[PDB]
Amino acid sequence: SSFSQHARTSGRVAVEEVDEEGKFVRLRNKSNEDQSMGNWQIKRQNGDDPLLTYRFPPKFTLKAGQVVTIWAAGAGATHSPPTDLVWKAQNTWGCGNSLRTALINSTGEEVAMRKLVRS
Amino acid sequence: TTSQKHRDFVAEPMGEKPVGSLAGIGEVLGKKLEERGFDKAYVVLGQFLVLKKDEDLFREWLKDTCGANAKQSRDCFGCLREWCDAFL
Amino acid sequence: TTSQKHRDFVAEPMGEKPVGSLAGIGEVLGKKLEERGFDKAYVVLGQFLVLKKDEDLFREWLKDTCGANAKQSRDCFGCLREWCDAFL
């Protein structure tokens, strides 16, 4: 895939999948307990480009073992909470040789990250 | 319990923060550490790791390095320990 | 280009892995390092940081501490640098 993945997770939710072409970002609750993600954020940095931030609804729950996939506006997916949220305000997550995805809780703390690097 | 500087440092990976970003490290202590050679946050983190996360040894080395007191050394050790627990 | 051990170490944060988890460190070098005191991977990470990520100093320190050769030292250094740039 020419992309090496490096992942860190400190909470119950991990950044499960990051699309190489910037179509979606998929997060999973790898715990046996549901996690509330109200006002949580996704930070995406693609090389030197300005940071892209997505904000979760003020009230939102990801149950144990479940998946929430934040889709881009250009992905053409169907918006359907709580499993599929579409970022209509952003065409795509972006592309490049340096893609960093970080999950941030409501308090501004980084709880997970997954970085993909290509040669 | 902790100052705002502590929370700011513990929140995110150190990356390239200067020594002045450490909780419990001010202008005087930062300048002294930079004079000693400890010119970046990661250097202090590595020195903390070498002493195997021991509180006493880390605080003693800090006291002999820059002349920090009980409060500043305690804040530095706490911030580094929590950062390791969060990211390392 | 890189051994599977190297990729396995780089993929995820070290946490508390044994010193034998580094790329280019086997049972023999691992045992020597553990006798020397650096009995955890993050301790070698800290010693790497203290030398300010300089390749030559770290390679020479590793060679003088355990007796590794050019290839083992190169692999360990490269793994540590990539892990620092991916997590630190």
Amino acid occupying residue B80: L
Helix (H, G, I), strand (E, B) or coil at A29: strand
C-alpha B27, offset from chain centre: 13
Min Cα distance C61 → chain B (Å) is 14
Annotated resolution, angstroms:
4.1
Question: Which of A16, A28, A25, A2 lies closest to A93, judged by CA?
Answer: A25
Q: How far is CA A35 from the centre of its chain?
A: 15
Distances (CA, A) of B79 to A96, B36, B56, C3: 34, 21, 15, 35
Q: Is the peptide bond before A82 cis (omega within 30 degrees of 0)?
A: yes
**Interatomic CA distance for residues A5 and C52, integer angstroms:** 25
CA distance C73 to C61: 10
Listed by number, the residues of chain A in 5-64 with a beta carbon closer than 8 Å to a beta carbon of chain B are: 8, 10
Burial A41-62 (b: 16+ CB within 10 A, else e): bbebbbeeeeebebebeeebeb
Q: Dihedral, CA atoms, A63, A64, A65, A70, nearest 10 degrees?
A: 30
φ, ψ at A3 (rounded to 5°): -115, 125
Integer-rounded Cα Rg, in Å, for chain C is 11
Question: Which pair of tokens denotes residue B49?
Answer: 């790791």
Range list of H helices, B1-88:
4-11, 27-36, 41-50, 55-66, 70-86
Asked if C11's CB is within 8 angstroms of A6's CB, the reply is yes
Token pair of C14 as six digits: 């070290």
C-contacting chains (≥3 CB pairs under 8 Å): A, B
Method: cryo-EM
Please give the full DSSP string across A78-101, using - where no structure is assigned.
PPBTTTEEEETT-S----SSEEEE
The answer to whether C71 faces chain B, any CB pair under 8 Å, is no
